[PDB]
């Protein structure tokens, strides 16, 4: 194939978005619970998603729209991400974040 991967350069600008919300879902999975209670929702909500989607995934979804619909523009993944972490989720947050995993450039040092 080939290795070219087109679009531009720009990270934690904007606020998730439906392309990213899905794509996180699948992060979050079944950490939604744990996010849940980090993204400042209501208990009713996490008893809600769980009743309106059985299947993890959705449930993850259904959270990050409620997120994304809640805080409006100010959804953004360095917000969510900053959450990940104190929820324990690092694993997320890495993932979200993605910054390397042993070289990524590193343009000359000093």
């Not at 980090?38 to 995934?57: A, F, G, N, T, W």
């Not at 409620?66 to 993932?95: C, F, M, R, Y």
Request: proline letters at 5%.
């Amino acid at each position: 194939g080939s290795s070219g991967s087109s679009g531009p350069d720009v990270r934690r600008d904007k606020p998730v978005t439906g392309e990213q919300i899905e794509v996180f879902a699948n992060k979050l999975g079944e950490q939604w619970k744990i996010l849940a209670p980090y993204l400042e929702m209501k208990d009713s909500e996490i008893r809600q998603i769980e009743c309106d989607s059985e299947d993890m995934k959705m449930r993850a979804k259904q959270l990050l729209v409620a997120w994304q619909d809640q805080e409006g523009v100010h959804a953004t993944p360095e917000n969510l991400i900053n959450a990940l972490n104190k929820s324990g989720l690092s694993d997320l947050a890495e993932s979200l974040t993605n910054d390397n995993e042993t070289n990524s450039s590193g343009p000359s040092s000093g």
